[PDB]
Amino acid sequence: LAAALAQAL
Ligand SMILES: *C(=O)c1ccc(-c2ccc(C(=O)OCC)cn2)nc1
Numbered sequence: 001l002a003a004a005l006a007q008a009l
């Protein structure tokens, strides 16, 4: 999950 969001940065 964290990676899924982290792609934004
Ligand atoms: C949430 O975005 C997210 C993305 C990816 C993963 C994840 C966990 C484990 C592996 C892996 O190769 O583990 C080997 C034991 C890859 N990706 N978790 C959460």
Ligand SMILES: NNC(=O)c1ccc(-c2ccc(C(N)=O)cn2)nc1
Residues within 6 Å of the ligand: 006, 007, 008, 009
């Ligand atoms: N918000 N995230 C980003 O902007 C971002 C963009 C690119 C990358 C990235 C990481 C690893 C490799 C590689 N070839 O290992 C290439 N690109 N990581 C993060």
Ligand SMILES: Cc1ccc(C)cc1
Residues within 6 Å of the ligand: 001, 003, 004
């Ligand atoms: C809830 C969730 C789990 C894993 C990824 C890659 C994305 C979202």
Ligand SMILES: Cc1ccc(C)cc1
Residues within 6 Å of the ligand: 005, 006, 008, 009
């Ligand atoms: C964990 C996280 C992901 C994305 C933003 C924009 C901020 C924090």
